[PDB]
Symmetry: C4
């Protein structure tokens, strides 16, 4: 288990540096709990570095197996066929957020869409006084900024540690075009736009 050692090693570097920079213990704690969640959910492997010298059609086969969980637990990504999956599975970037961390701020102009695989997030207004929803596994958000061609309509914060998949606006728009049910999503963006005014 030099992995576990390497893991605890490749964080004391950060830890030593941050101790030297005299950061607060609250922040320091957030760093540690991240690295713990990082270890327990990924076991020291780095999907990028380990799969880099793989040919594209193998990178594609691995992705459909190891990142299939997202695709099976999104209840409108069935009847979609393996062609739709094919164009999307390599453009799902896994990102990790911690509890309290902002993923989207309302007014922003991003168009990236996030698919939740683990954890739960808050959908809030600008003043953060209103909680429009709680989204979790098999759900997604950040889809409205493109369908409605509008800025981000709401703020999204993490409640827990979240395993998310980020989809770039470019891949997103290409999907809607080439794969119209792109309208059950649009029929979801609307009902959210409705319950927002």
């Amino acid at each position: 288990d030099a992995a576990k050692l390497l893991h605890r090693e490749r964080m004391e570097r950060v830890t030593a540096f941050l101790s030297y920079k005299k950061i607060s213990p609250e922040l320091q704690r957030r760093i540690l709990e991240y690295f713990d969640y990082l270890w327990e959910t990924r076991r020291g492997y780095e999907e990028r570095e380990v799969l880099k010298e793989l040919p594209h059609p193998l990178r594609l086969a691995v992705a459909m197996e190891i990142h299939g969980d997202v695709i099976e637990k999104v209840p409108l990504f069935k009847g979609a066929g393996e062609d739709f999956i094919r164009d999307i599975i390599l453009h799902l970037e896994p990102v990790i957020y911690g509890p309290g961390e902002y993923i989207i701020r309302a007014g922003e102009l991003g168009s990236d869409v996030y698919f939740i695989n683990r954890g739960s997030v808050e959908v809030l207004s600008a003043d953060e006084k209103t909680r429009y929803a709680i989204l979790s596994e098999g759900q997604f958000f950040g889809e409205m900024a493109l369908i409605l061609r509008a800025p981000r309509t709401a703020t999204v914060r993490a409640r827990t540690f979240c395993d998310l998949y980020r989809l770039d606006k470019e891949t997103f728009d290409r999907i809607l075009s080439r794969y119209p049910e792109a309208a059950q999503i649009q029929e979801l963006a609307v009902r959210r736009k409705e319950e927002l005014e």
Copy 2:
């Protein structure tokens, strides 16, 4: 033979990770047979990394010797002279496909052209019910999308393990311009377009 050890080492990393990600044995097997074909055809060397700090005119001399096999076994790349070779030999990127793997899908908009050095590939239709050809060493494909200014006219799958050379659309168009026999290829793209309708 730390090379052979390094080789078997720089794959157990992938193997351990994929075992942990709980991939299927069929996929796992495809990974292993790739790395075996990779070892036997390349012996652990990485042409990119080993030749990187070489000056351009040496990179050019090595390429004509070690990637000459392609150029000698393509029976319309003779009478082409060493000037035509010169502008093409560094833009032939070696890629590896496995049996069953799609290289080109019909309808796609790529313009990259592939030259076969080893193995054999299938030329299929969209429904894959029709097999227009079997191409192997000294043959090439993906040339029609540019000459005809059309999308990919057919699907190309590997039958075996294939050593291919990818040529970018940019280098391809520049070649046709500056080196017209660019027409025996065009007279090949036509006869294929004919036997396709």
Copy 3:
């Protein structure tokens, strides 16, 4: 303290090379004093490399703590709120200059703005006969080239070793737009433009 060893190691490489290239002792001395200031002010850590695999919202939290000193000692960056900080704190690049080194030359077309955290700099004319100011901790310069849409109005040299933060023109213009007090700065650029003619 292999750090201190590594540090003294990762400079003898430069030192050996420069000794071999037969550089002057004055220059050689400037190299050594830089590496000393580099060690004493940073203790061998490399903020880029150590924080690279951190998620964005953590990179953001660390930055506000460890690069907060700049933001607290700039007496017009209060009442600015944590939203203004948020969009700026990751676009402050720390750079080091040595005594005598030119940071800005008049006539140049850069728009980057520099915020001083440590040390002192000279504001000079083209002929360098005139010293318009001495700027130090909590002050900044290079702001006039954008507000006035003019080339650099003056030459800026370091008097001492300076810890500066560079802000790109792109982030700078975005700040002025979205955060108008952008006018107490403009009311500072003017009074400098006045006392310059």
Copy 4:
């Protein structure tokens, strides 16, 4: 002298690979003599890697000292002042050619200009039947393609091992603009254009 060992090490990798790829002994020999010239002229240091983490104004001071030889031995780069040097010294990229190697081919569209620091080169016509000149230390070539806004007017081959400095077209055009004597060069491009027809 692990340097000399590292040097002989970081070439047997190339040597082993090329032996395995079954290259010709003539080519193999050209590789060895390059690496020898590389060792004797650079002693295993890599100016890029060794100076990378240096601040710009130090990279600038070192360059004027270690790459000053070029600037002092070009007899029309005096009376040029340290401002002209300043904008050029970091845009001189050192490249190495071997005897027989083409640096420029006539008809080509490059605009890069080469300054000779060591060795000698041939200026030839397309048919290579004519030798317009022999250029060596303190001389330069490739300047006519930009001044005359024409393609390369002649072929340039190395006679010996040459230490050259490459200047990009972008830096070149900027120099001519901001530093007109840009005309003693133009008065050199003309006399060459004359003695060429």
